[PDB]
Amino acid sequence: VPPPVPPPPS
Amino acid sequence: GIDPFTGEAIAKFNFNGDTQVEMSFRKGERITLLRQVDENWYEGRIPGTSRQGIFPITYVDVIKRPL
């Protein structure tokens, strides 16, 4: 299963 | 694999990026790693195309790190 996508870089 | 400073990865899963900044791809595509932006994201490009952008490190299997 594809993992959750994190917040983009800060 | 022309550039000695680039890295190399294989897409683990399809990645549908939300915006133009993200580079979408399909499972199994090779990716040239250009840089590691932070703990969670690479910038990379697909050889032989004009596709380039960022994507999560968790979506790729890394053969060689970018430098």
Residue ranges of A 1-10 with Cβ closer than 8 A to chain B: 2-3, 5-10
The whole-angstrom distance between residue B46's C-alpha and the CA centroid of its chain comes to: 7
Sheet holding B52-56, edge to edge: B52-56, B41-45, B30-36, B7-11, B60-64
Size of interface A-B (CB pairs under 8 A): 26
In chain A, the residue whose alpha carbon lies closest to the alpha carbon of B22 is A8
| Domain extents in chain B | 1-67
Query: Which residue among B14, B40, B41 places its CB closest to the CB of A2?
Result: B14
CATH of domain B1-67: 2.30.30.40
SS (H, E, C) chain B: CCCCCCEEEEECCCECCCCCCECCECCCCEEEEEEECCCCEEEEECCCCCCEEEEEHHHEEEEECCC
